[PDB]
Amino acid sequence: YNKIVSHLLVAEPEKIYAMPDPTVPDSDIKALTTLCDLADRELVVIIGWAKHIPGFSTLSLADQMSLLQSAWMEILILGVVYRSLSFEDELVYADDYIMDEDQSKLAGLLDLNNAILQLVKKYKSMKLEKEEFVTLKAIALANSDSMHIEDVEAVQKLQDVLHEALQDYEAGQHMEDPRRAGKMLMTLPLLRQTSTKAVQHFYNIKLEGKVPMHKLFLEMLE
Amino acid sequence: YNKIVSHLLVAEPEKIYAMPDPTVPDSDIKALTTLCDLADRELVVIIGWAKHIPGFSTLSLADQMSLLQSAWMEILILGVVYRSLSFEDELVYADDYIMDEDQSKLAGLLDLNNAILQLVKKYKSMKLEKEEFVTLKAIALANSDSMHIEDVEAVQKLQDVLHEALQDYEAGQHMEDPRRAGKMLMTLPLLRQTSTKAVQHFYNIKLEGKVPMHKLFLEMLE
Numbered sequence A, B: 001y002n003k004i005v006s007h008l009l010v011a012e013p014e015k016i017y018a019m020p021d022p023t024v025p026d027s028d029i030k031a032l033t034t035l036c037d038l039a040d041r042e043l044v045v046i047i048g049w050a051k052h053i054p055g056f057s058t059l060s061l062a063d064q065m066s067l068l069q070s071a072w073m074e075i076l077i078l079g080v081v082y083r084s085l086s087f088e089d090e091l092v093y094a095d096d097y098i099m100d101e102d103q104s105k106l107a108g109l110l111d112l113n114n115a116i117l118q119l120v121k122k123y124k125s126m127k128l129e130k131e132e133f134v135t136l137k138a139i140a141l142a143n144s145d146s147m148h149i150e151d152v153e154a155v156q157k158l159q160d161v162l163h164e165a166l167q168d169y170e171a172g173q174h175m176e177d178p179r180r181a182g183k184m185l186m187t188l189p190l191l192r193q194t195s196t197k198a199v200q201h202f203y204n205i206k207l208e209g210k211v212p213m214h215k216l217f218l219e220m221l222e
């Protein structure tokens, strides 16, 4: 069994409850608040998680920040996708916050949650395993295509190392499909597309708040 | 040598000149007109090209249209990227229409053309070959993630067939890097991201015109 995959499995953060405020009337604002508060907590643990990825900490702080800046929404989305694989037309943002179509409509997230469900659909068909999920999260971080990378070569080595882990996993676990690793890689474009739209929506409705995201990753990394 | 790759090479369309109107004063409008007129001509030949891809014609007309609808901007962009690999900070839209930074600024395309140059940068480092380019164009078509596919399984078989061709090519041509096929696949997210932004920009400034894109692919396919 592949050691990087094993390591990523033990580095996996614990479940986080959303705790929607039971005193607040249901509304689009309440849904967005709940999601913002959930994501902020998730981002803190994502930063800690990334430090476990072999080679990530040896990048400059600027490069670590750049990768995180570019990847954070993909990592959040891949999480909700994975959590939702055993459900039907619903998204498990947390065990206590499962969004059906009516809820998504109410939150103004129909189009976005429908795209996320498209990711779910594909991964259900492919029978996405936890091992594959955690490896793809790490790959999405390393492959996030920041336009501000200092050490392009080191970031490529990190991509290489993680891709190798996925290939080695699939070679051992899935001999019935010698192309499964590539199929997994071919799911990344839809994740990127969905993230891109989610981030556009995030800025369009001003969820970023008073303090820029750049400084937030700084505080947490420094 | 891989037959699908060989076939794709012979299916490659001839060069198309942009023919910017020499009587028209240079302006953002002239640049956008030139690009619109270039793309429209390219789209006609792209539709003919897709018919050469093994299995594409045996899909329903609806599925052919769906793949084209979802992929067309990626295919256009991958073309300009490939045409630009031997240039520096300039995009070869056509032999007679090469956009430098000043031109992009003037056209309102700085951000978009900069993203396209990011694609170029990565492919230069990877030493992207024509064989790899034409194969990735076909993969981008098949992997374009339309939300309206009728025969999900047939579209997967098409993805499979093209992925197999890339893997077989790389296995024979690039034994020094057993992971090169996966590296090529890992370039697709940035293409998707760039296309997504280009399409958003395309609709934001109303370049679609009086007739919807759906009917355009119909006419040309029927």
Ligand SMILES: CC/C(=C(\c1ccc(O)cc1)c1ccc(OCCN(C)C)cc1)c1ccccc1
Pocket (backbone or CB within 6 Å): A035, A036, A037, A038, A039, A040, A042, A076, A077, A079, A080, A093, A109, A112, A198, A199, A201, A202, A207, A208, A209
């Ligand atoms: C898709 C749901 C979502 C977020 C989300 C996704 C996955 C997940 O596990 C948790 C949340 C989302 C919402 C807000 C957000 O902002 C965090 C920044 N702070 C400073 C508010 C990030 C993601 C969202 C994204 C954009 C607009 C509206 C909602």
Ligand SMILES: CC/C(=C(\c1ccc(O)cc1)c1ccc(OCCN(C)C)cc1)c1ccccc1
Pocket (backbone or CB within 6 Å): B035, B036, B037, B038, B039, B040, B042, B076, B077, B079, B080, B093, B109, B112, B198, B199, B201, B202, B207, B208, B209
């Ligand atoms: C990135 C350049 C570009 C186009 C382009 C890209 C590659 C290429 O080889 C040729 C052109 C572009 C521009 C217009 C366009 O519309 C075609 C639809 N008709 C009906 C006008 C498609 C692509 C463009 C895209 C969006 C907004 C503005 C410009």
